[PDB]
Design a protein around this ligand. Structure first.
Ligand SMILES: CC(C)[C@H](N)C(=O)O
Ligand SMILES: CC(C)[C@H](N)C(=O)O
Lengths: 91, 90
């Protein structure tokens, strides 16, 4: 499984997830898993995307950070099996 | 006060943009998301944690009408699933 996990720190405002996924949509780029949780006592959230490793990711990652509501992006700084662990309880 | 809206959708690019776009076009914030692929299928499950809202009534028929949304279920998952997940994440 050549997947990578992008962990985004975003503003918790309407529209943010549509802007982020929209960038994958415009590249015909499937997102495999998503988690989004608010960060307590803040106006921000984390979004985790699970996507396949692709030669276009580095430029897409740069495009994600340029979004006004994305304050930060990390790649493969999350538990690599988090979606396998979550799935076990919720399927 | 929150509710989970549960979608079965086609696991294809742009599908999550179409779903979240419905909320964005109403300035309706989404508090929690989980999306997981359904194994041995072309579908994924999406759980959306949102404020139970008079607006969420009008939205629900809009979501169901999306070509790529296979099924909509509402209030069938305890909203604490997101608190349970959260105890394990930074
Ligand atoms: C963080 C994200 C899910 C944002 N709350 C939105 O509704 O687009
Ligand atoms: C199901 C959803 C996350 C879809 N795979 C998409 O990339 O929009």
């Amino acid at each position: 499984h050549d997947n990578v996990i992008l962990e985004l720190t975003v503003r918790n405002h309407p529209g943010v997830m549509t802007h982020v996924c929209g960038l994958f949509a415009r590249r015909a780029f499937n997102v495999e898993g998503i988690l989004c949780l608010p960060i307590q006592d803040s106006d921000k959230s984390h979004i985790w995307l699970l996507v396949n490793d692709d030669q276009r990711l580095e430029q897409m990652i740069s495009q994600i950070d340029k979004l006004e509501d994305v304050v930060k992006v990390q790649r493969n700084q999350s538990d690599p099996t988090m979606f396998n662990k979550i799935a076990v309880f919720f399927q």
